[PDB]
């Protein structure tokens, strides 16, 4: 069941006195005329922000509550009990029966304490303090929620520190409200007690009473608030995509190159896809170093370079920053601060031939290591030692570029592998290659949140009739506010009217005549009120 509070769950926000002073407060209250659960006789409830809790009987079936996050061990909780003797507050780590009505553990106790009817309680928990307000009124019924006003006086204060997310009850009819941040107007007696209140977010009369800070409004017309239409979503127009950026001249070429003279190709204005390259599931090595393979589809770049060649199978590990060997010492050196991805796959069915395919040579001898990302095609003699040969042969002279032998009748690791190395850089180029992106079409005649290639704003968009000279990006208004734009994609001018906004006034005949009310939304078109 569910029931309706009427004016219930008002507590003194603090100490301090007061005489006849309509005191306005902002705090956590139980809103007037709320939807309070009903329980008969129970289960684990939430807490989430304070709790109102009433109860009715002449016997004592309600024997305290239990609080916490897990209501067990492994985390701490509170326990508030009352046998026929008196109250027993307690804070340990417990083991609670899932249907408790005694416990089963009392470890690590960090706080102890020992020593019909309507009994209301307000529980809240702020800054490690667990506050409890309470009130005991006598009903002239037995167990139904009555009507009336009765303010709740503070009882306890516990500097625990405990976290709370759940609570229960203990039994040998009760309700559960929740508290939200509201603003109230409390009427104080001359002895200093709260006798009446106003919830200032109920209807127009209450909002007027709150605006005036009074309980009696005289006839008139009062500005009470404002309306403002709300904007949803946010378009993001952009000039025609651009390109598709093919790499068929990278991967799908008719032949790769040899590793002593590796080819290279840069990338310009493009839309470069990267997920569709990865998921083909035929790649021997796909190793991304400075980037994750799942973020490409979204990060713009400033320059992309592709290297491509053929090397054997037992040297694909050499294409990595900080290796050693005839492919990385002086054929292809990678710099240590690399950020691209090495892709490589076996090509024993293209670059292989019985009898041999000797197009693919490689340097096997060099004076020393060759820094990163340069090459050498200085095909000369090689010199061995203290002899002057200098271009003879035979007596330990050489030509330092040996061909490969690639037949299909050769074991793996000695087979041709095609290698494509991607390298990126990002310094300050304001518009370069980005992956497959997506925003959303444009809309009109609705207060919207828009972005037109940099112009960020809010408002209603409408078809224009202002001839934007073929060269005018937008429209400027005296006092300098953007009032027209041009769509990059379709190149049409659109006006940007502002989103409705306006005061709200309340018309009342006076509370001494009636409590009906009328409402004026000032210079707002009456079709966009709610």
């Amino acid at each position: 069941a569910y029931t309706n509070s009427f004016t219930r769950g008002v507590y003194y926000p603090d100490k301090v006195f007061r005489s006849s002073v309509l005191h306005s407060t902002q705090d956590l209250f139980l809103p007037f005329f709320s939807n309070v659960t009903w329980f008969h006789a129970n289960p684990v409830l939430p807490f989430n922000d304070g709790v109102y809790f009433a109860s009715t009987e002449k016997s004592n079936i309600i024997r305290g509550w239990i609080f916490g996050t897990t209501l067990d061990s492994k985390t701490q909780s509170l326990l508030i009990v009352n046998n026929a003797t008196n109250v027993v507050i307690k804070v340990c780590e417990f083991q609670f029966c899932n249907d408790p009505f005694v416990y089963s553990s009392a470890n690590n106790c960090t706080f102890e304490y020992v020593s019909k009817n309507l009994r209301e309680f307000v529980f809240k928990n702020i800054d490690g303090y667990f506050k409890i307000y309470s009130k005991h009124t006598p009903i002239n019924l037995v167990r139904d929620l009555p009507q009336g006003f009765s303010a709740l006086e503070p009882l306890v204060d516990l500097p625990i520190g405990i976290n709370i997310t759940r609570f229960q009850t203990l039994l040998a009819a009760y309700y559960v409200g929740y508290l939200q941040p509201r603003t109230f107007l409390l009427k104080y007696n001359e002895n200093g007690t709260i006798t009446d209140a106003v919830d200032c977010a109920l209807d127009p009369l209450s909002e007027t009473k709150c605006t005036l800070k009074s309980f009696t409004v005289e006839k008139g017309i009062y500005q009470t608030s404002n309306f403002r239409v709300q904007p949803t979503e946010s378009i993001v127009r952009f000039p025609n995509i651009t390109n598709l950026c093919p790499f068929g001249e990278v991967f799908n070429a008719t032949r790769f190159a040899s590793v002593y003279a590796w080819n290279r190709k840069r990338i310009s204005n493009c839309v470069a896809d990267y997920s569709v390259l990865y998921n083909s599931a035929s790649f021997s090595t796909f190793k991304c170093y400075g980037v994750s393979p799942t973020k490409l589809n979204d990060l713009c770049f400033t320059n992309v370079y592709a290297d491509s060649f053929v090397i054997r199978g037992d040297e694909v590990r050499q294409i990595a920053p900080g290796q050693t060997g005839k492919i990385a010492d002086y054929n292809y050196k990678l710099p240590d601060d690399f950020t691209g991805c090495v892709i490589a796959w076996n090509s024993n069915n293209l670059d292989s031939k019985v009898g041999g395919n000797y197009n693919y040579r490689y340097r096997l001898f060099r004076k020393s290591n060759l820094k990163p990302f340069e090459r050498d095609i200085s095909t000369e003699i090689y010199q061995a030692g203290s002899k002057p040969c200098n271009g003879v042969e035979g007596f330990n002279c050489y030509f330092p570029l040996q061909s490969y032998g690639f037949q299909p009748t050769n074991g793996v690791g000695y087979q041709p592998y095609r290698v494509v190395v991607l390298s990126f850089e990002l310094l300050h180029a304001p518009a370069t290659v980005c992956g497959p992106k997506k925003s959303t079409n444009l809309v009109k005649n609705k207060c919207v949140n828009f972005n037109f290639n940099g112009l960020t704003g809010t408002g209603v968009l409408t078809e224009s009739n202002k001839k934007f000279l073929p060269f005018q990006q937008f429209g400027r208004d005296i006092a300098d506010t953007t009032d027209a734009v041009r769509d990059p994609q379709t190149l049409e001018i659109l006006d940007i009217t502002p989103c409705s906004f306006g005061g709200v006034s309340v018309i009342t005949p006076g509370t001494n005549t009636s409590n009906q009310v009328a409402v004026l939304y000032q210079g707002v078109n009456c079709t966009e009120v709610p």
Partner: antibody, heavy 120, light 105 residues
């Protein structure tokens, strides 16, 4: 994928026989094919390979010089051309696919269902 | 590069599990395929590349092993799955099939 082979029968020791293998389904080019014999009452053993156009053919033992395998993707079949035979390679023959040429070739394998050749 | 299957014929009932081993003369990685040849049928393939079986082959067939030693396992096949088995490599040219292992009861 499908593979249909033809050219079986009874011959004499020193004739010839057209061993043809027809393929459909998957694209017959971009794909490496080969043959495999089995003498009835033995295991399995291969014959000859062809590499997606005739540039490189490898052969097995004791079949080099009597066997000219050729493919032709402009009519999408495969041939062994058994020629001047022996009375000891009476067997069953299967054309199968080695697989893959490019990176986008999605290697799948498939076999025929046999072609029986017998001698006198 | 010659394959071999060293366990000979076995007599495992319709139940229990069977484990069949295939070697290689040198290093072959993720390149083997298993065939199950009945008496007088076409050799039906089992397992793509040491780990995933093809379509129409149930889950009780599993294929694993690495380095140079590979293994096919029958968890609890059924009351028929008795034939000869072959391991083949697709590393280089050409694909050698090995020897073969029968199973009886």
């Amino acid at each position: 994928v499908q593979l249909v082979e033809s050219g079986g029968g009874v011959v004499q020791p020193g004739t010839s026989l057209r061993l043809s293998c027809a393929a459909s389904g998957f694209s017959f080019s971009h794909y490496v094919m080969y043959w495999v014999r089995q003498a009835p009452g033995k295991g399995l053993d291969w014959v000859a390979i062809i590499s997606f156009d005739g540039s490189s053919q490898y052969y097995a033992d004791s079949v080099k010089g009597r066997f000219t395998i050729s493919r032709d993707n402009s009519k999408d079949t495969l041939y062994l051309q058994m020629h001047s035979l022996r009375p000891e390679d009476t067997a069953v023959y299967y054309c199968a696919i080695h697989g893959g040429t490019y990176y986008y070739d999605k290697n799948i394998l498939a076999w025929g269902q046999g072609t029986l050749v017998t001698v006198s | 590069i010659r394959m071999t299957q060293s366990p000979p014929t076995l007599s495992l009932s319709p139940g229990e599990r069977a484990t069949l081993s295939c070697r290689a003369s040198q290093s072959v990685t993720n390149y083997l395929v298993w065939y199950q040849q009945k008496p007088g049928q076409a050799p039906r393939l089992l397992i793509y590349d040491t780990f995933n079986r093809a379509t129409g082959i149930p889950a009780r067939f599993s294929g694993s092993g690495s380095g140079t030693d590979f293994t096919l396992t029958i968890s609890s096949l059924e009351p028929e799955d008795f034939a000869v088995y072959y391991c083949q490599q697709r590393s280089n040219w050409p694909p050698t099939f090995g020897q073969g292992t029968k199973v009886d009861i």
